[PDB]
Ligand SMILES: CC(C)C1=C2[C@@H](O[C@H]3O[C@H](CO)[C@H](O)[C@@H](O)[C@H]3O)[C@H](O)[C@H](C)[C@@H]3CC[C@H](CO)/C3=C/[C@@]2(C)CC1
Ligand SMILES: CC(C)C1=C2[C@@H](O[C@H]3O[C@H](CO)[C@H](O)[C@@H](O)[C@H]3O)[C@H](O)[C@H](C)[C@@H]3CC[C@H](CO)/C3=C/[C@@]2(C)CC1
Ligand SMILES: [Cl-]
Ligand SMILES: [Cl-]
Ligand SMILES: [Mg+2]
Ligand SMILES: [Mg+2]
Ligand SMILES: [Mg+2]
Ligand SMILES: [Mg+2]
């Protein structure tokens with residue numbers, strides 16, 4: 001998984 | 007479904 | 013704008029752009045490669061096709077969204093923005109058609125190349141026909157028809173029924189019949205005949221060629237399933 | 241180039257472009273709206289953010305693909321094309337940062353607006369930091385840090401712990417710690433503290449606000465799961 005940003 | 011083209 | 017870049021570097025950069033899903037860059041690199049004046053190889057024709065199909069495909073998908081909104085609406089904003097997208101789409105089709113007329117098609121002597129470029133000519137006139145209105149419109153439709161017909165005539169004389177370019181040509185010409193020419197019976201006849209003649213030639217193929225041909229045969233089946 | 245279009249028409253066209261997934265057009269329409277000089281509403285700030293996040297997100301994804309190819313390779317083509325993508329990415333970050341400095345941030349007095357624009361300032365410096373090298377680099381990193389820190393300071397004083405902009409700010413600042421500042425412990429501390437304080441404030445929320453807050457809390461949990 002790639003880390004989440006928003 | 008949408009018809010296929012290629 | 014790609015005039016100063018080596019041909020081989022443009023091709024290499026097109027492949028990098030494809031990996032990066034940068035299809036506008038991919039198309040510009042491939043336009044620069046065509047403009048070097050040399051014929052394109054099989055792999056290079058495929059890069060040219062993939063690049064522009066992705067670019068025009070994004071524009072068409074957007075145009076369909078905006079046209080749907082415009083039709084439900086029927087101020088000037090929706091129509092203006094649909095027109096803007098339409099004009100840019102037209103410009104990309106005109107660019108491709110220009111590459112084909114100056115001078116890809118006239119130098120293409122082998123069946124594989126000539127059929128590939130005439131299929132492309134029919135596809136980009138068909139895209140122009142999707143947005144066209146009136147009789148200006150009739151000549152655009154007949155240009156798509158004529159290019160597809162010449163490609164079909166060569167393909168039938170020069171290529172096996174399982175050849176993937178022949179199969180994709182027939183698939184696209186049958187879509188042209190169904191949705192541009194208002195000829196769904198012709199579309200269905202063409203997709204069925206093409207599917208049947210390819211089925212009967214599969215036995216001649218290697219495992220790899222079989223995989224390539226059956227992939228496009230499945231798209232023919234998908235269309236017949238939708239239309240019947 | 242959007243100088244002749246009414247503000248309300250630019251906003252309307254931004255919403256149409258979003259529906260059509262035309263994010264470059266969306267960003268240009270929203271840049272034109274900012275350049276009208278008036279503050280942006282909550283909905284308009286969201287359109288501005290969505291538009292540029294999608295544009296820069298495509299450039300970053302491409303840059304990562306090309307950088308990976310370049311690093312495995314280590315002629316000039318891969319490096320040249322990575323540089324081209326990098327320069328265009330830098331230009332978009334500089335455009336956004338320019339909009340924030342001329343003059344969104346200085347006119348933003350309410351906490352919701354000021355925190356939103358300082359988060360954006362930290363995000364676009366962080367994107368510049370992803371591609372930067374050396375110490376030129378240190379000042380870029382510290383610019384991202386400083387903008388995030390000021391946003392965090394306001395958010396803690398002025399917003400509830402469940403506020404979605406506060407939650408997204410913390411999420412992004414924690415990514416900044418983990419992958420730009422080489423401070424994974426700080427990243428983990430910040431994501432955990434933020435998650436915990438939001439959990440304890442959920443009881444105050446409507447069903448709709450709860451849905452909005454828990455959506456971003458899940459992204460915090462996703463990161464902690466990846467990092468621990
Ligand atoms: C995956 C197949 C169906 C495609 C090919 C193409 O496949 C080839 O190119 C791709 C790689 O770029 C395929 O993934 C690859 O396996 C190769 O056989 C196929 O041979 C032919 C040329 C089809 C059928 C008609 C069109 C050309 O207008 C066409 C295009 C491409 C390049 C794009 C879709
Ligand atoms: C779907 C949520 C998580 C998002 C919102 C946004 O949601 C809102 O906008 C979207 C519609 O454009 C949502 O789908 C909508 O439900 C609304 O609540 C959310 O309130 C806040 C502002 C999050 C958290 C931090 C960023 C701002 O930098 C942010 C951005 C957007 C506009 C984009 C993602
Ligand atoms: Cl417009
Ligand atoms: Cl380049
Ligand atoms: Mg040369
Ligand atoms: Mg028009
Ligand atoms: Mg020749
Ligand atoms: Mg032959």
Ligand SMILES: [Mg+2]
Nearest residue numbers: 245246247248
């Ligand atoms: Mg006005």
Ligand SMILES: [Mg+2]
Nearest residue numbers: 323326327371
């Ligand atoms: Mg550089």
Ligand SMILES: [Mg+2]
Nearest residue numbers: 279347348349
């Ligand atoms: Mg103010």
Ligand SMILES: [Mg+2]
Nearest residue numbers: 351398399400
């Ligand atoms: Mg408050």
